[PDB]
């Protein structure tokens, strides 16, 4: 059982928003919304298809940020010449994940992008 506005599924609470904003703002946002809230997480196509319809019914835009940001910035690396990677110079730009309603798949997009949020 979830509060007003929020829909329930399995054991969590969901809530779509049209307030378009970048990944970080979308995250900090979800937290301020409710203690323990973060961008939606998806551990199965089942939960996914649920969040999909939640969007289609409540939200205008056919997509939302999900919950993964700065995707390939803190990985284990190495140069092709087998040399070690001590020195780093990773640009501030970075990729985050978004889910498109229709094709219901995941796309990578610069976290700069402005999209609708779907807390949980």
């Amino acid at each position: 059982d979830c509060p007003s506005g929020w829909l329930s599924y399995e054991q969590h609470c969901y809530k779509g928003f049209n307030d378009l904003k970048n990944w970080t703002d979308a995250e900090k946002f979800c937290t301020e919304q409710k203690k323990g809230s973060h961008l939606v997480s998806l551990h199965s196509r089942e939960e996914e298809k649920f969040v999909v319809n939640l969007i289609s019914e409540n939200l205008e835009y056919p997509a939302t940020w999900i919950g993964l940001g700065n995707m390939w910035k803190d990985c284990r690396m190495e140069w092709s010449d087998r040399g070690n990677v001590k020195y780093k110079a990773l640009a501030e730009e970075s990729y985050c994940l978004i889910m498109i309603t229709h094709e219901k798949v995941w796309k990578s997009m610069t976290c700069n992008f402005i999209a609708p949020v779907v807390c949980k």
Binding site: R82, G83, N84
Partner: protein
């Protein structure tokens, strides 16, 4: 003149020449080439004593390609990993039929005599033109003793000395003005220790020859040719002892009489050497033996190795001068890349990176503190001389550990 020098040589006959694996004929050709070589080296007091000969009848233990540079490199790494481990010797030559590119007849490393990976040389056998082959062998061994090619004004009586960059159809048997000087310079600089005492007569495999200034089995003595012999107790011709003399040559011979037993015939050169005393039964000093490999040396700054005490700092000085020293570990990490200069072992010319535990055995990096610099990781590399620059095998890579002859930082107790 020069001090008597002896090169304990081992010759390798590759599959090419090993086709008709049948020895006999080959050895005869070899013995004559060698003897001829000594006849060339006489005026320099250099004596090459053949203490071994191997045949590669089965296969070629290393790929003998058309590239003389490639083959030598491969041969050098083999001579260090295989041969040296099995048989003890100073230098090693590989005799082949192989028609190398660029018309080359022989190749070796500069001032490499005594060095594990670089005391090697390649020689293309000129069929049965034995003497023309001897010149090549001489031309190389000399390059290995710091001798360069004859330039603008280097003279000899034949107008075509041994060190000419081009082998004439009737090569001289004389060394040049420049060569003599280059050699003298080699000795006062590299100070080779592995070429001072000859091998026991017992171990020389070449058929005895009187007058070759090489006391061999069957010879009563040998002060060389009657021409340049100053031995009051040896027959310059018949290699026989004069009237009242027990010996002619040997560390255990004095005033022409066999030294008494218990008398030291060969002291210990360094801390990595063990003295030898006369048996009293022969004028020939017993086989030279060095300290037990592994034994600490230089106040635990290293561990003995076939007579020497290799230490990274010194090898850095050899390469970059008195102002040089070993670089900070950080540099040796370049040896993991398996770069063109940063690697350890090589397989078929292919450079293999070092396991994180053997980085102190690949390319040596020095901190040459000489102005104009900007690189704290100096290293030596030449595609024609890649082994020089690598950490000398025997070196101490860590407390209780040393590099073996296979670019590995193994445990001293297990390396010996």
């Amino acid at each position: 003149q020069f001090n008597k020098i002896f090169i304990e040589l081992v010759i390798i006959v590759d599959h090419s020449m090993a086709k008709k694996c049948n020895s006999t004929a080959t050895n005869t050709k070899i013995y004559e080439i060698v003897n001829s070589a000594n006849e060339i080296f006489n005026p320099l007091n250099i004596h090459v004593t053949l203490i071994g000969v191997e045949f590669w009848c089965d296969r070629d233990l290393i790929n003998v390609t058309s590239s003389a540079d490639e083959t030598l490199n491969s041969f050098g790494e083999w001579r260090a990993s295989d041969l040296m481990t099995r048989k003890s010797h100073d230098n090693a030559l590989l005799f082949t039929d192989m028609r190398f590119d660029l018309n080359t007849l022989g190749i070796t490393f500069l001032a490499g005599m005594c060095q594990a990976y670089r005391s090697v040389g390649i020689v293309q056998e000129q069929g049965n033109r034995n003497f023309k082959t001897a010149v090549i062998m001489a031309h190389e061994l000399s390059h290995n003793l710091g001798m360069y090619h004859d330039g603008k004004n280097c003279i000899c009586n034949d107008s075509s000395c041994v060190m000419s960059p081009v082998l004439s159809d009737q090569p001289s048997k004389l060394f040049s003005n420049c060569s003599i000087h280059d050699y003298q310079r080699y000795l006062t600089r590299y100070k080779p220790k592995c070429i001072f005492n000859p091998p026991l007569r017992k171990d020389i495999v070449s058929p005895p020859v009187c007058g070759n200034e090489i006391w061999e089995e069957g010879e009563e003595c040998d002060c060389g040719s009657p021409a340049n012999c100053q031995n009051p107790c040896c027959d310059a011709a018949t290699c026989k002892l004069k009237p009242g003399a027990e010996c002619g040559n040997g560390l255990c011979c004095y005033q022409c009489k066999i030294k008494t037993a218990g008398t030291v015939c060969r002291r210990a050169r360094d801390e990595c050497d063990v003295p030898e005393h006369c048996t009293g039964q022969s004028a020939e000093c017993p086989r030279d033996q060095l300290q037990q490999n592994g034994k600490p040396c230089q106040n635990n700054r290293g561990y003995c190795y076939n007579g020497d005490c290799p230490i990274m700092r010194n090898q850095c000085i050899s390469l970059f001068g008195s102002r040089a020293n070993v670089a900070k570990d950080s540099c040796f990490q370049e040896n993991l890349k398996g770069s063109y200069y940063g690697y350890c072992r090589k397989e078929n010319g292919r450079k293999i990176p070092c396991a994180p535990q053997d980085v102190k055995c690949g390319r040596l990096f020095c901190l040459n503190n000489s102005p104009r610099n900007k690189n704290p990781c100096n290293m030596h590399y030449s595609c024609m001389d890649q082994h020089k620059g690598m950490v000398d095998p025997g070196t101490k890579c860590e407390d209780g550990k040393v590099c073996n002859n296979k670019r590995q930082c193994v445990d001293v107790n297990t390396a010996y």
